[PDB]
Amino acid sequence: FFHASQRDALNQSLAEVQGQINVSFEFFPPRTSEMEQTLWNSIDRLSSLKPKFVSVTYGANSGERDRTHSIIKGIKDRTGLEAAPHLTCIDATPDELRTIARDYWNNGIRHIVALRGDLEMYASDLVTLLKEVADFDISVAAYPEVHPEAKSAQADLLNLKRKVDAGANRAITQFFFDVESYLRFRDRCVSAGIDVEIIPGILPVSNFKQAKKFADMTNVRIPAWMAQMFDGLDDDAETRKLVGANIAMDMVKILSREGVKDFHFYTLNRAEMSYAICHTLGVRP
Amino acid sequence: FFHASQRDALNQSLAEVQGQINVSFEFFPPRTSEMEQTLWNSIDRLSSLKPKFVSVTYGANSGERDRTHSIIKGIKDRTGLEAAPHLTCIDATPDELRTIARDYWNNGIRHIVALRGDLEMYASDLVTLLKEVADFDISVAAYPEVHPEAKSAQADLLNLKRKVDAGANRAITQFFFDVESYLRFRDRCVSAGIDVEIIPGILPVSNFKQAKKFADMTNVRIPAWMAQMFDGLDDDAETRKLVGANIAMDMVKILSREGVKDFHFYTLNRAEMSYAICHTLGVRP
Amino acid sequence: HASQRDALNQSLAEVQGQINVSFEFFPPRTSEMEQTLWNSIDRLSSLKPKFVSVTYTHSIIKGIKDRTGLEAAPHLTCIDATPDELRTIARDYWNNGIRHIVALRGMYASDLVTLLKEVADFDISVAAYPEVHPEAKSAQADLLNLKRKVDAGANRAITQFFFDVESYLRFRDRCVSAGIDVEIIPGILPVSNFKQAKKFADMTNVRIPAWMAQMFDGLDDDAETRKLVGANIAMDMVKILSREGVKDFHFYTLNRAEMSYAICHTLGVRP
Amino acid sequence: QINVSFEFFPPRTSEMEQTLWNSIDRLSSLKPKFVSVTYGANSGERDRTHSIIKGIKDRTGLEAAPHLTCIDATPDELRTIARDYWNNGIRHIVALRGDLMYASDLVTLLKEVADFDISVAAYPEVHPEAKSAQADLLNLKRKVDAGANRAITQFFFDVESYLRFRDRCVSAGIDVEIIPGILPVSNFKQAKKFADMTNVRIPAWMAQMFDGLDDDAETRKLVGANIAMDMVKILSREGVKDFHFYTLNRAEMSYAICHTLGVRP
Ligand SMILES: Cc1cc2nc3c(=O)[nH]c(=O)nc-3n(C[C@H](O)[C@H](O)[C@H](O)COP(=O)(O)OP(=O)(O)OC[C@H]3O[C@@H](n4cnc5c(N)ncnc54)[C@H](O)[C@@H]3O)c2cc1C
Ligand SMILES: Cc1cc2nc3c(=O)[nH]c(=O)nc-3n(C[C@H](O)[C@H](O)[C@H](O)COP(=O)(O)OP(=O)(O)OC[C@H]3O[C@@H](n4cnc5c(N)ncnc54)[C@H](O)[C@@H]3O)c2cc1C
Ligand SMILES: Cc1cc2nc3c(=O)[nH]c(=O)nc-3n(C[C@H](O)[C@H](O)[C@H](O)COP(=O)(O)OP(=O)(O)OC[C@H]3O[C@@H](n4cnc5c(N)ncnc54)[C@H](O)[C@@H]3O)c2cc1C
Ligand SMILES: Cc1cc2nc3c(=O)[nH]c(=O)nc-3n(C[C@H](O)[C@H](O)[C@H](O)COP(=O)(O)OP(=O)(O)OC[C@H]3O[C@@H](n4cnc5c(N)ncnc54)[C@H](O)[C@@H]3O)c2cc1C
Numbered sequence A, B: 001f002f003h004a005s006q007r008d009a010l011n012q013s014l015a016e017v018q019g020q021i022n023v024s025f026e027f028f029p030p031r032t033s034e035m036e037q038t039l040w041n042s043i044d045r046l047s048s049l050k051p052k053f054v055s056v057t058y059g060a061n062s063g064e065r066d067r068t069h070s071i072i073k074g075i076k077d078r079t080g081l082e083a084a085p086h087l088t089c090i091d092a093t094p095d096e097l098r099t100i101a102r103d104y105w106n107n108g109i110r111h112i113v114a115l116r117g118d119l120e121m122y123a124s125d126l127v128t129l130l131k132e133v134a135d136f137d138i139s140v141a142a143y144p145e146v147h148p149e150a151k152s153a154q155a156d157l158l159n160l161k162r163k164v165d166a167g168a169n170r171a172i173t174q175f176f177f178d179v180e181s182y183l184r185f186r187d188r189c190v191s192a193g194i195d196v197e198i199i200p201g202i203l204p205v206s207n208f209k210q211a212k213k214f215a216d217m218t219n220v221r222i223p224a225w226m227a228q229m230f231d232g233l234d235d236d237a238e239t240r241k242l243v244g245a246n247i248a249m250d251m252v253k254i255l256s257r258e259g260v261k262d263f264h265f266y267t268l269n270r271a272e273m274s275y276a277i278c279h280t281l282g283v284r285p
Numbered sequence C: 001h002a003s004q005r006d007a008l009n010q011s012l013a014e015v016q017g018q019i020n021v022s023f024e025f026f027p028p029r030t031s032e033m034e035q036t037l038w039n040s041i042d043r044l045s046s047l048k049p050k051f052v053s054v055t056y057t058h059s060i061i062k063g064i065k066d067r068t069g070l071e072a073a074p075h076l077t078c079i080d081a082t083p084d085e086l087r088t089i090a091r092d093y094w095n096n097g098i099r100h101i102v103a104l105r106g107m108y109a110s111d112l113v114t115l116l117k118e119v120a121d122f123d124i125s126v127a128a129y130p131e132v133h134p135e136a137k138s139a140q141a142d143l144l145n146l147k148r149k150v151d152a153g154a155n156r157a158i159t160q161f162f163f164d165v166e167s168y169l170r171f172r173d174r175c176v177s178a179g180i181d182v183e184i185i186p187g188i189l190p191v192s193n194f195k196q197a198k199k200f201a202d203m204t205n206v207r208i209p210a211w212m213a214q215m216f217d218g219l220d221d222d223a224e225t226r227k228l229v230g231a232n233i234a235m236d237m238v239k240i241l242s243r244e245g246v247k248d249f250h251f252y253t254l255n256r257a258e259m260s261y262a263i264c265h266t267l268g269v270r271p
Numbered sequence D: 001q002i003n004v005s006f007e008f009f010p011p012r013t014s015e016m017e018q019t020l021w022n023s024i025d026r027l028s029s030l031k032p033k034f035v036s037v038t039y040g041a042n043s044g045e046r047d048r049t050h051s052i053i054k055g056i057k058d059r060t061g062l063e064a065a066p067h068l069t070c071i072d073a074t075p076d077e078l079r080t081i082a083r084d085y086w087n088n089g090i091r092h093i094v095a096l097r098g099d100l101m102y103a104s105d106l107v108t109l110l111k112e113v114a115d116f117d118i119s120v121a122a123y124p125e126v127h128p129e130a131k132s133a134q135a136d137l138l139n140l141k142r143k144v145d146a147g148a149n150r151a152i153t154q155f156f157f158d159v160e161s162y163l164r165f166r167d168r169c170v171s172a173g174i175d176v177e178i179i180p181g182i183l184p185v186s187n188f189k190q191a192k193k194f195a196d197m198t199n200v201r202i203p204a205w206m207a208q209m210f211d212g213l214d215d216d217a218e219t220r221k222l223v224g225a226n227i228a229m230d231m232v233k234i235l236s237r238e239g240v241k242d243f244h245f246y247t248l249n250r251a252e253m254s255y256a257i258c259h260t261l262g263v264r265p
């Protein structure tokens, strides 16, 4: 009865949203010939979905800044899509950052994901610095379950407001598996007067061990039912993929029904899962 | 809020049912060396799930009866699992059927899926004939959306009652995608005084074109959202598999919450999807 | 509540093209009603119903068959007729292309079914009463009679109109567990005139739910609102019935096509 | 227990003028809490809106609220107009911006003139020009904080959309009533045009329901009344006790819908 009809309604609603969802994909700089090939294969397949934009990460304190910039250029040259480099300020001086920013702008890179990076400058300072350089589109990190270093949930929330007030035109969340946490956070952002959309960062899980490691380092809660779902699958990649896709598809269906029309996917350079999740959202070639 | 909490509750409930679900798998006689290999690979993998039983189909009017019996023997000899041959009465005389039945019993085959088969004997007649031969475990076909040849839903329902009264100890449904139809049918079976469990026959869909063909021939309704879900995937087998697994997993989660503790899977000789669906039900090696 | 409504409406939209409908008419008593009736026939015919029937007549049936070609099934009662004449009329119909006959009493219906059977292989349709026929001594008794009529050869059963959906559903559940293997086709009475409808009800022992009485309260002089409210009630009823598996509907048009036509439209039954 | 309001538009032809007054007489018997009259910048102007408001008041004694926008109007002009309306007994105004001062600026301006009862527009499916859903919700809060006494929503056909929106409003601390604007549909072509211009979602089952009825007004009316009655029934079950009807100057449908809600003469 209830559970059945609820499913049908949720499913039909999702079907009718086709054509109204905006998506973006996050990639990281390949470290090997194999990953390089995989990445470009993924870029080609996901580019057909016409994402609002794609972004490329940059490991803070890595000194591999050139890799990020190189990938960004290649993406623009091959797809004509807007590619946003992630830029951290914890490992660079204001002068270096202004130089880096000016170069991006002159190279046609007009969207930057401004982050602080892990341990004189916090992300909000980078946002201001970037806005002084040029009228950049700026995306910043949001934490539904609170950044692990925040003094309080209130402080972390106020910090997001600070970043938006400084010029950030959108917020992208750390991944989460507790859907209610995201929804509650979205309401709190309204209460704090934040007027930008809080874009959910979605992590499709095929490798649970890896996800649990990411999660444990970021204070993200993995529900008991999810841990039980992946238990016993250490050596079953096929079942992990099916189970993970089911989880992600369930997640975006509920989010879509709650009015979310923008999704950012942590692809980890693989396209299969994100491509299928987008398919269910009506985002097709 | 609502949709979110409902998901969490459904998911947690499913997690807690681990160890209480009975499953069975249906296979068909391979027609080529390739399918033969695939089938035994699937048998080996699904056998580790300890199914209550497995069954092997027999195409009515095919004259390939020996193929079914051969596969059944091989399964018993290799796994030690109960293997139930499907037996049709539309293409054999009572004498031939009694002979066939006696041979099965003497060969250790004590469970038969008694069916009529497509066009002097209806399935109910076969049930009676089988019970006279020996004390067989007998499974019969049930149709939540009504068999296409029934004079009415009432007649088809009364026919199921006839089969049970004649000796059938369980009913297995034709596949369905409208979960409410199964639930309503289960309630009607109670109203008709049928005291056996109505086991849902689950069809995990990876090939939509094939499923639609099966469905159109059997009066099974494919919801509009499901047709839209597979639209545009004719040449994308990977996405079809992920989408189909999501549908099947959603289906058994809702069924499980409604008290269903028995599931029969139409594997079409492939194990991957059914194996993963069983994993979500807590049915693991 | 909201989601369930969305699910019900969608499932209804998908049943489009699989529901069978039939329309019941009555012989006109005036030139005006003659005009109205045939206009309805032309209108409702475009919906290609499984069949249409005329209360008891033979002429109207012929005209319908000659004008639309639809299976016109005339009603037949046991009153004012002898078994001899019955067989005569029965054979008179079958010999005129009339294959479907709604056997009614008005010497019971069962005997009428048996008689038509012993004459030819007609498609017999009898009456069913979800709220028990007023004359019947008991619910079970009237129930067994229906079975007797079905056993006698009644192909399908058509219920007296009703407004309490649960009553029809409970009755259908008792019909199956009673061994009746025919579909209990719900007879739908779209209400535009509450006074007239309440009259029929009090004459057939049909219950008018309190909510229905309240819904029509104060509309004696508001035909417009009555029609919208009645169409709504009939709409909701067939929607719920459809979700319960009912794929056959019989409409008591009272020779008017507007409402029945609209209700069919929502069931996917369109030209 | 349930309060209703009706919205009308200034007639532009003699035929529509007759229709409107017939509808006013019919609907006034239901004693609505108030009725409102829309404004068409290039389709009637403020004088026509005002004329109808005055006529309704004189003929029925009902509270009539003009829809007042601030496009191509100066603050001084708006103050002069509001003062005149107040002095003439018009004490409820539906304050709007109008398509391209924001509505919140008008609310403030009006409250400075007098203690007007003020209603503002709300969008369950977000105003088309809003930066985001969050920004549109914060704007509604700004309008309420500026003095708006209630919010009236753009029409919708996805009931859950309205329910989820109402919940977000409450979470945001918006304490006034979020009154659903109901559009009974008898002309689907016209409704779809309205919807396509305002980001309002039309469920698949609904589009399907009106398919093939382009030249069948009778069936459209019966089908649309069913949809509307179904909608208000669910909304009522969910705690809604105020409905605003987009009559499009016709009374039959809204009258019947109110009847089912127990709102009768
Ligand atoms: C969408 C997304 C993409 C990412 N991509 C990358 C990437 O490519 N490379 C990489 O290195 N990292 C990346 N990260 C990780 C990120 O850099 C870390 O989470 C980092 O520790 C914080 O960065 P931030 O931009 O959130 O910092 P901030 O917004 O500055 O927040 C960090 C902490 O400082 C606190 N804070 C802010 N201002 C003050 C103040 N004045 N005093 C005290 N505390 C204060 C905050 O509450 C918080 O606890 C990403 C995160 C997200 C969610
Ligand atoms: C779990 C499952 C497994 C199957 N496996 C196979 C297989 O291996 N091989 C194969 O050939 N087919 C198979 N089928 C398909 C099946 O044989 C067809 O659906 C067939 O047309 C009916 O078989 P049945 O056993 O349901 O027949 P029955 O139960 O006899 O029903 C068939 C029809 O006859 C009607 N009926 C019954 N008694 C009477 C009566 N006395 N008078 C009039 N009508 C009556 C019923 O209402 C129904 O419409 C399977 C179906 C299911 C659901
Ligand atoms: C679809 C429909 C169409 C109709 N069309 C017409 C029409 O065209 N013309 C017309 O004149 N009337 C018509 N009627 C009304 C009908 O004729 C009356 O309801 C009438 O009272 C007889 O009903 P019946 O045909 O069910 O007879 P029956 O089926 O014989 O049942 C009537 C009563 O007799 C009782 N009963 C049956 N057998 C016995 C027995 N052996 N001993 C004692 N009690 C017994 C039953 O329980 C019941 O109370 C229609 C009704 C319906 C529902
Ligand atoms: C009940 C109802 C009745 C209506 N009646 C009429 C009528 O009679 N005549 C007519 O012409 N129109 C009418 N409208 C249509 C309305 O005028 C349009 O929707 C118009 O485009 C916006 O009006 P508003 O009052 O909602 O403006 P606002 O509430 O000002 O909203 C308009 C947009 O501006 C945004 N916004 C608000 N403040 C700011 C800011 N400071 N910076 C940036 N963006 C901001 C909002 O989020 C929104 O996208 C009606 C609408 C409703 C729902």
Ligand SMILES: NC(=O)C1=CN([C@@H]2O[C@H](COP(=O)(O)OP(=O)(O)OC[C@H]3O[C@@H](n4cnc5c(N)ncnc54)[C@H](O)[C@@H]3O)[C@@H](O)[C@H]2O)C=CC1
Pocket (backbone or CB within 6 Å): A026, A027, A028, A029, A057, A058, A059, A060, A062, A118, A174, A175, A201, A203, A214, A215, A217, A218, A266, A268
């Ligand atoms: N939340 C996010 O989107 C990201 C967070 N980070 C954080 O910064 C640290 C340093 O980055 P790297 O030098 O690349 O470390 P790394 O080399 O371990 O990570 C490689 C890549 O994996 C992906 N990844 C890693 N952690 C992730 C996370 N928590 N969420 C989503 N994607 C993730 C990113 O694409 C990252 O570039 C990471 O260990 C992580 O803590 C880094 C990139 C993205």
Ligand SMILES: NC(=O)C1=CN([C@@H]2O[C@H](COP(=O)(O)OP(=O)(O)OC[C@H]3O[C@@H](n4cnc5c(N)ncnc54)[C@H](O)[C@@H]3O)[C@@H](O)[C@H]2O)C=CC1
Pocket (backbone or CB within 6 Å): B026, B027, B028, B029, B057, B058, B059, B060, B062, B118, B174, B175, B201, B203, B214, B215, B217, B218, B266, B268
């Ligand atoms: N419902 C069921 O479980 C089955 C139904 N059937 C019906 O009997 C007919 C004849 O059988 P075959 O000679 O094998 O035809 P076939 O050669 O086309 O089918 C081969 C196999 O595919 C699977 N299959 C086909 N239709 C199916 C269905 N509707 N549901 C679940 N599995 C299905 C069965 O394992 C079947 O043995 C089929 O076309 C079908 O209509 C046959 C087997 C199973």
Ligand SMILES: NC(=O)C1=CN([C@@H]2O[C@H](COP(=O)(O)OP(=O)(O)OC[C@H]3O[C@@H](n4cnc5c(N)ncnc54)[C@H](O)[C@@H]3O)[C@@H](O)[C@H]2O)C=CC1
Pocket (backbone or CB within 6 Å): C024, C025, C026, C027, C055, C056, C160, C161, C189, C200, C201, C203, C204, C252, C254
């Ligand atoms: N339930 C039914 O389908 C029918 C019931 N009857 C009833 O049997 C008696 C004799 O019939 P008439 O001389 O035609 O009476 P009548 O002259 O009052 O009725 C004329 C026609 O209106 C329709 N009608 C009348 N009552 C109805 C009802 N309760 N339900 C559905 N349709 C109805 C029928 O088409 C009937 O032929 C009357 O009491 C009449 O109401 C007659 C025909 C059909």
Ligand SMILES: NC(=O)C1=CN([C@@H]2O[C@H](COP(=O)(O)OP(=O)(O)OC[C@H]3O[C@@H](n4cnc5c(N)ncnc54)[C@H](O)[C@@H]3O)[C@@H](O)[C@H]2O)C=CC1
Pocket (backbone or CB within 6 Å): D008, D009, D010, D038, D039, D040, D041, D042, D043, D099, D154, D155, D181, D183, D194, D195, D197, D198, D246, D248
């Ligand atoms: N949401 C509302 O209640 C209203 C919205 N508007 C919108 O403002 C803009 C300018 O208006 P006009 O030039 O008069 O357009 P128009 O000339 O197409 O509209 C004429 C009249 O029809 C009614 N109407 C039109 N759109 C409606 C809607 N979406 N919802 C309810 N009633 C509606 C109103 O009474 C309006 O005065 C248009 O986009 C129009 O849709 C105008 C009046 C009311």
